[PDB]
Design a protein around this ligand. Structure first.
Ligand code: NAG
Ligand code: NAG
Ligand code: NAG
Ligand code: NAG
Ligand code: NAG
Ligand code: NAG
Ligand code: NAG
Ligand code: NAG
Ligand code: NAG
Lengths: 117, 407, 98, 98, 49
């Protein structure tokens, strides 16, 4: 509306602002933030690590993979599925598998067995 | 009365619904971002306050791991993924509503789809962590449990899955509840129709009353409320001059600004501590519910339970799990006696000077003749030496009646 | 007090007593049948014979020893009153709550 | 011994008591009355702190509703209210105390 | 602070009482409305009623 100058959401945080000089409604998005997790095999085994930026799209951030949990750097995606070793997020687990590197995969629920009814 | 018994002459197959929460939303907090935002002056004092931030982070991480563990405890009981046979004929019993629907892109059963539709379930340092197991994986666990129950009965729970025709499984479940196999085999079509009608009514019953799913919704609502409250708590002044830290820093001198920043830090740290304690209590409640759900999955779905009212209302026959957003819905198929009839009963039959007691069942008189019947169903048979044991004399027993025992 | 109020419970003691009486009457006259469906009346000695078969003991044991079992049950019920009356600590948990 | 067994020749009917809490007193607290009494200045100062009083009210109301639900769950097993017959003869078993 | 302490302690006690109430409901369903073969769940000995 003409008299309104700011905009607030249900959480009482500013979401839009009217530019004082030219009347234009500019939406405000909070600058990207997210937790950083270090996926590590035991330091007894290796010193290589992967880094998961949780909830951060891979644009904002030597293999880069985008999963629902966030952006994963340092783990290679493998199509084959194994039992979960290090949980990462929405169905993706990491493991240290043989060179010899850190792989990320969709975890396998179990062996498929069809009973002969 | 001394001599009055009531024996059922029919049965009803009733399917009931039990909704149980399993997991709650996993949340993470950045203590510095919440309390101080981007202000370094606030961060320096927060460093002085102590190790409260690490304690809160550890508590929230433990809660998240606990939620994941609850989900695995409830759903990951099956060692192998079982698939229903391609030809879905199961003796006239119709599992289309509970079995996965390939046409649906989500690969979910109609009841699961309705549950997902019914319950549909700010950024100031607060993040929501996705669950380890996606809804598709929980659906696959549920489908595996259903396939194991349908094809193998309870054998897959206690060891290798063993094939069995579904009518035989129902007959053995009737034997479990105390009813002979002939009752199932003679009345197979009626029982199949009753089960089909009850399964059909389950969907309409769930759709009609949203409050049935309210528990799950309540869980979600609670989480939202908590998070919302926390965000609104940033608008509070907590005794300081203003909520915004930049305004305090610019308006006042540094030494005076220290006390205002300290008040804001104390208020926001107290708010975060209250939030963490509340979610610790809620996580304890959800863990209790998830343990109950795991026990039900082990006892109602993977076996037949003799515990009264643990698996539905009535005599438990079987159970079927269904996934729901942040919870599990158990469909309990139970046996309910119906159409009772009055009869005259006696403790023992006196013949040739000897008492006779029934091996199974009780003695029943239709006014002129005496029979032996099973307890939960009226199937009268002639009193014979095969279904009676003598064990005593005629004088001691109170209420004994004289009648013949054929051989 | 000062803003501290105690809200009366929804169910009065009379109503809880009526629920207890209903459960007792059901378990006496119908056995366990009223829990799983329609209440099916059954003579109480026959119900106790059912329960004896449940614990692994035949019916003849009860029907031959009916008076002895009745006397034992009556004596035990009589002793329960004295045991509760003599020791207040038996109810301590409830008291502890308050 | 690998050829010796012990079999009971008699029995005892034993009645034991188990006491279980079900509900606790339902309390409602007025945040303004407790913290500030009748003072308007204190109430205005308290409004700056935030929604603490609302959270307290929600928690206490949840506890009270939970107590009512506890009593309902424990004692409302049966839909019907069963009544014992006027003739109180149950095979020699005396239930007068219960 | 006093009210927060009171409410937190009341919540914990409410959780404990809820656990006790669930146990009581389970006992009423199994000990009273049926015969229980679970050992020591319904008294000491072989449960009759
Ligand atoms: C990340 O940004 C790209 C931009 O091309 C977009 O396609 C993708 O969906 C985004 N991912 C997430 C998780 O938002
Ligand atoms: C039958 O029931 C009546 C109840 O009025 C009782 O007086 C009588 O003793 C009972 N008969 C026997 C044999 O117990
Ligand atoms: C049991 O009920 C069904 C449903 O009405 C009925 O068709 C059937 O005849 C009944 N059984 C007997 C023995 O009457
Ligand atoms: C029974 O199965 C058919 C498909 O064979 C389906 O169309 C129908 O809805 C099912 N009825 C139920 C589940 O009651
Ligand atoms: C009782 O059963 C017998 C055998 O089935 C039958 O001959 C008799 O007519 C029945 N009496 C009544 C009253 O139904
Ligand atoms: C058979 O039992 C009835 C029931 O009391 C009794 O009246 C009758 O005398 C008994 N017959 C014999 C031969 O004992
Ligand atoms: C019991 O074990 C002893 C060994 O200590 C053996 O000598 C004896 O024969 C066994 N008794 C029976 C009945 O097998
Ligand atoms: C069993 O004990 C009772 C007393 O409780 C006694 O009267 C009866 O004779 C005993 N029976 C045996 C088998 O000794
Ligand atoms: C039951 O016991 C009471 C004493 O506790 C006694 O007064 C009463 O007469 C007994 N019942 C009968 C029917 O004798």
């Amino acid at each position: 509306l003409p008299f309104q100058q700011f905009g607030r959401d249900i959480a009482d945080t500013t979401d839009a602002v009217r530019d004082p000089q030219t009347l234009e409604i500019l939406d405000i998005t909070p600058c990207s933030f997210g937790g950083v997790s270090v996926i590590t095999p035991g330091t007894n085994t290796s010193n290589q690590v992967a880094v998961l930026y949780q909830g951060v799209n891979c644009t904002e951030v030597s293999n880069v993979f985008q999963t629902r949990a966030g952006c994963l750097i340092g783990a290679e995606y493998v199509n084959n599925s194994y039992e979960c070793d290090i949980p990462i997020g929405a169905g993706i687990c990491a493991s240290y598998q043989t060179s010899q590197s850190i792989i990320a995969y969709t975890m396998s629920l179990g062996a498929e067995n069809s009973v002969a009814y | 009365s001394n001599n009055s018994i009531a024996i059922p002459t029919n049965f009803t197959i009733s399917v009931t619904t039990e909704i149980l929460p399993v997991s709650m939303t996993k949340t993470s907090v950045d203590c510095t971002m919440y309390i101080c935002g981007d202000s370094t002056e606030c961060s320096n004092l927060l460093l002085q306050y102590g190790s409260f931030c690490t304690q809160l982070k550890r508590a929230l991480t433990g809660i998240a791991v606990e939620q994941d563990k609850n989900t695995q405890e409830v759903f990951a009981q099956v060692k192998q993924i079982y698939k229903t046979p391609p030809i879905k004929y199961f003796g006239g019993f119709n599992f289309s509503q509970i079995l996965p629907d390939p046409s649906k892109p989500s690969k979910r059963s109609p009841i699961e789809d309705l549950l997902f539709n019914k319950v549909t379930l700010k950024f100031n340092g607060l993040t929501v962590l996705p669950p380890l197991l996606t809804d598709e994986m929980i659906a696959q666990y549920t489908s595996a449990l259903l396939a194991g129950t349908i094809t193998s009965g309870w054998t897959f729970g206690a060891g290798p899955a063993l094939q069995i025709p579904f009518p035989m499984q129902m007959a053995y479940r009737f034997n479990g509840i105390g009813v002979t196999q002939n009752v199932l085999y003679e009345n197979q079509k009626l029982i199949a129709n009753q089960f089909n009608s009850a399964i059909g009514k389950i969907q309409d019953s769930l759709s009609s009353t949203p409050s049935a799913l309210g528990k799950l919704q309540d869980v979600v609502n609670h989480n939202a409320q908590a998070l919302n409250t926390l965000v609104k708590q940033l608008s509070s002044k907590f005794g300081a001059i203003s909520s915004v830290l930049n305004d305090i820093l610019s308006r006042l001198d540094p030494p005076e600004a220290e006390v205002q920043i300290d008040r804001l830090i104390t208020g926001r740290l107290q708010s975060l501590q209250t939030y963490v304690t509340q979610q610790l209590i809620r996580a304890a409640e959800i863990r209790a519910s998830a343990n109950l759900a795991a026990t039900k999955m082990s006892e109602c779905v993977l076996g037949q339970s003799k515990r009264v009212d643990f698996c539905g209302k009535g005599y438990h026959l079987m159970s079927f799990p269904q996934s729901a957003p942040h919870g599990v819905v158990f469909l309990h198929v139970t046996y309910v006696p119906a159409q009772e009839k009055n009869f005259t009963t006696a403790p023992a039959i006196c013949h040739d000077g000897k008492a006779h007691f029934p091996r199974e069942g009780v003695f029943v008189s239709n006014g002129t003749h005496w029979f032996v019947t099973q307890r939960n169903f009226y199937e009268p048979q002639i009193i014979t030496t095969d279904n009676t044991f003598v064990s005593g004399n005629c004088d001691v027993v109170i209420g004994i009646v004289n009648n013949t025992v054929y051989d």
